[PDB]
Symmetry: D3
Subunit: 213 residues, 6 copies
Amino acid sequence: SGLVPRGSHMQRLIEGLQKFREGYFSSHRDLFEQLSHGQHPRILFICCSDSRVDPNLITQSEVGDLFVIRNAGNIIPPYGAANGGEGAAMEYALVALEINQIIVCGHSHCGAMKGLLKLNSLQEKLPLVYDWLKHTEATRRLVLDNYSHLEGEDLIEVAVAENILTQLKNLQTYPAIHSRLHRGDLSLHGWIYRIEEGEVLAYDGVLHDFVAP
Amino acid sequence: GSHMQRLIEGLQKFREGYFSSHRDLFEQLSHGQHPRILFICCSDSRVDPNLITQSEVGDLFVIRNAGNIIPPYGAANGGEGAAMEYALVALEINQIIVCGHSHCGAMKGLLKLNSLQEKLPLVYDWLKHTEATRRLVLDNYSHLEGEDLIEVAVAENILTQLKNLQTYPAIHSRLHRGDLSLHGWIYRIEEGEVLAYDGVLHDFVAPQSRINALEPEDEYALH
Amino acid sequence: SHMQRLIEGLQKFREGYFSSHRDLFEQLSHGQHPRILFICCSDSRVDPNLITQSEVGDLFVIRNAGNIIPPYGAANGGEGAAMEYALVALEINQIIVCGHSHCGAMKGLLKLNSLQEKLPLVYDWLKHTEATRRLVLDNYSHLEGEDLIEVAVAENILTQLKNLQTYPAIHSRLHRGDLSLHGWIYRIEEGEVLAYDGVLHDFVAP
Amino acid sequence: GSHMQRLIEGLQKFREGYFSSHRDLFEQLSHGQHPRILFICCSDSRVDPNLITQSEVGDLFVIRNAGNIIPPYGAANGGEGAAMEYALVALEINQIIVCGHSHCGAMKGLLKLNSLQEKLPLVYDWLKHTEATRRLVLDNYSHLEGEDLIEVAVAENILTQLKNLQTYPAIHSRLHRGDLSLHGWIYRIEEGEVLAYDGVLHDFVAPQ
Amino acid sequence: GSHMQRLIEGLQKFREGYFSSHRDLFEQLSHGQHPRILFICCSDSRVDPNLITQSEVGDLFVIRNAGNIIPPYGAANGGEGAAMEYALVALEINQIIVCGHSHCGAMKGLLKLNSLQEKLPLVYDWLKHTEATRRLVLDNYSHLEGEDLIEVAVAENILTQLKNLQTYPAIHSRLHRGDLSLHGWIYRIEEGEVLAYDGVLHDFVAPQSRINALEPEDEYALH
Amino acid sequence: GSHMQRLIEGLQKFREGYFSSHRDLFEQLSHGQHPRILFICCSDSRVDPNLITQSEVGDLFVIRNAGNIIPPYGAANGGEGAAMEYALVALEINQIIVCGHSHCGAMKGLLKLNSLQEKLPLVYDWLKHTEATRRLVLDNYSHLEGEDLIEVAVAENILTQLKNLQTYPAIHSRLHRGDLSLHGWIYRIEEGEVLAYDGVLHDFVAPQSRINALEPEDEYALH
Ligand SMILES: [Cl-]
Ligand SMILES: [Cl-]
Ligand SMILES: [Cl-]
Ligand SMILES: [Cl-]
Ligand SMILES: [Cl-]
Ligand SMILES: [Zn+2]
Ligand SMILES: [Zn+2]
Ligand SMILES: [Zn+2]
Ligand SMILES: [Zn+2]
Ligand SMILES: [Zn+2]
Ligand SMILES: [Zn+2]
């Protein structure tokens, strides 16, 4: 009986689907026919679930190019630490799809990172988030131990950057990655997407900093 | 690398193109995200949730893994449950879509599960969370083969994830209150359409705003 | 003392009930062929064979504190395995989740954080019914005392039915129409059972 | 449904019958349970702990699973450890009985363990908590087969659970204190008798 | 760096001295290890099992962790069970010694367990495998404090580990078969002495080849 | 007499010999340990870390398991991570050495992993934590066999554990600060020498105080 305020969102989404069907799909039938025969992505793109991040949009990629993992905080647990989807998706990308490029892309104003900086406060209302963030506890420990001089937005920014670097260390513990890095076949990349400025900063191992590509 | 070079050129095209003509949207979004849909879909590079729904940046909070699987509550400690909880509890999302798709690699693997152990051991382990799909399909659709069998696995996998979602505390509590809807979508890549599960009918039909994927006889709720 | 009573009781059984039911026990010795999987609480006030006046051999029984079945893959104790054996090996096609009034596990659930010190294993176990706790705290925040416990008993049963639906053997058999699930509340003081009815969305006298 | 209909008719029969004849007992029990025994037994439908011990409602706090197994402390996160902890710590029980039984399906499975993984994967994983039974039986009773081997597996499984119980904090502490006792029982269905493990004789013998 | 320079100088002394005088021993050992004792002891730098027993290389197969703890069977997936299994099954070792020691940091932590969660979260979780020791000590020695309390915890921890070892399949089976014995030793660092648990006596006494740590009353075995 | 009789006689020789000449040291050590090195090595009886480095009691805090394996952070709940955390956080150690050795039984097992399931199931499961070694060796050294293959597995196993160590919070934070160093050593039993990994060179060389195992291209740090 009466007002149920969630319904407009679904109507809108279905209208948007019809617009895709009538618009982009209708002008790209050959592309979708070709793709239906198989995916051949060349990039594994790991990024946050945050609704403000669209990997295809910011890279102006066409459908078929990016095999994408999305979770809160763009975290890849150390090998063997977790039995969710992250390790399996990465493995499929590298072993079945033969991808040779992995990007860990974090972003400004990340909610997972804000949470990480107030971790104990999450237990009560966000218990699964609290447990999940333990897979990036190395970030938290490094940030709390070494960056106390920072506050506010500067501190969140450092947490976003350090979290990406933690995931690169975590990735190095997976068998498929360790083997292929020996082979010399595979490259890892760390990116920060700055939402307000529409830009990406990439980690440069010589400068030990995230800088414009 | 040519592929990385293409992405960097793409970044510039975005900044000079779409970003430049949507600066106010991005400054607004810089203050916070307010999505109204949790969209769970496959990592498959052929699937773009924002594209297929013509969503604007800010609209869809997205989980992507191989096979668009959500383990039952307490079964796993990866990203899935946590991202869903963040969406529902922190972001107050009230619509969840489990979106599968045609020709899904994870589903092909599920139908040849034992063969995955050697080269795809993590995928083998992960697909344990959709074992109910495999059991149901092998038991009840034993006469299907080839493309038809993969199509059934894609569809049934979505239905399994909907059962798995209903074991999470945030979901269970909100369904009692009647404040949340669950949807199951199959994106057909070549055909350019989506099919949606109508849980009253117990079948997939074209999307419409008054269906959802819950099966009434399994509500198990008081008043 | 109470061990002695049990030992005397063994004698009473052998000379009484066993003596007058020799055909039954000789029959049972060839195999178990239960009809029902009965999931209930460890509470000493609950006796499923007694309240249903079942014959020995009819009920394959799982008993734990709170009559909880964790979601599939969440736990590696006895519950899932016993259910699987019941359905796959023994071909049982009826499952009853039976809760009961005044359940200690439910009292604990409503004071969960306080259990961590002296009952750490109970604290961890009750996490498998956290969906109950969250639902009850969110949606019955104005209920108190006995009333709140009674609601937690009822809602706990329904949570377990949801959890059962995640198991492969259950999911597959429900598809085929070869399995039925039931939720029961046993009211100790009144000697009655109320059964969940999915059309009424309520627990009703059968 | 005829099976369910028969249960319902049994409920009414309990109400008008045993319940009506024991109103006082149930009113009293409505105020709390005060069992003095923790009874761990198999889910097997042929086993009824209250029946075989001629116990009254309220006497036995009961754990039932396939094979009457208690995993070692920390090994599992299902119901067993928690129910035992509730019994000992909250209900102050000071007697624990592990009761196995003849013809146990879990034990038949244990003796063909690898064959179970395909159709009974959860049972395969669960029986690993009694792998010490399997190893012991394979290494030390190689000259038994068939029903004799199953019977020895039933007996040995009980002893393994006693060892497993001894790893739980509440049990370890209270055994040291001296205010807790453990017991191992085998219920022979076909004979209507229980044999209890005797540490002096190192065998299961009739109680008296 | 200076620590490393000094350590590498010590390595050079080993090479020049003991190695050069024992080349044949090391050649022989290179063909296979044949130890006859599994020695479980603490990681504490004050404990050296070969030194205190004046053993030769090749004699002791050694497990070292903080607190000399062996989790119950199935409780953990670290190295302890696997190392023990290799010792018993592959190397046919018939003697296990659990050796604790005075002033053990793990035991000090155990007695203040809750205080460890913040800064030593992994130690906190690990010590749960000896929670039976903590519970026993808090329940049965409640009037002890300070060093007396730590001393009791050291001793009781050894007895807990013996219970935990008895849940492992190889141990359970070989105790019954007759090819295994268990021992529980306390090394008192300040005095250079060891006491051994005599399971018949239920007390710690001088070590003796005739005694072992199993209590006859708790055998739980069929004969 | 028996192995146990020898050990017990050895206790008395220790007390009346070495303990006497180091009586002041042991009195000092009874007040607290202050090691400066965390030494991780195999349980193998042929390895004695204090002997091979001619270390004094109090110098080396030691972890020993089969194969000298450190699981990745969060992957395991046995003793390894806890012991390392105690060493770094409670004892402020600033040097970690992962020491493997020639002819390692864990490495022989790793190369015949499937065969271990039946009689060494716990070892099979434990070796999962060094699967990255097995994958690398099978993929990249597929043409080696016999002793040559075991030798490469011993070396690559050390490198895997160094990657695993770098996932732990205490290590990651201290590496940022620059007050911790990681080393990878191979102890060659017959030959009486140690080889150390120089992470700049990406190869094993004779030990020296100004190398360590860290690979500069994988520093992944902000400065
Ligand atoms: Cl996306
Ligand atoms: Cl549903
Ligand atoms: Cl019962
Ligand atoms: Cl050592
Ligand atoms: Cl490195
Ligand atoms: Zn984010
Ligand atoms: Zn897919
Ligand atoms: Zn109850
Ligand atoms: Zn049974
Ligand atoms: Zn110690
Ligand atoms: Zn070794």
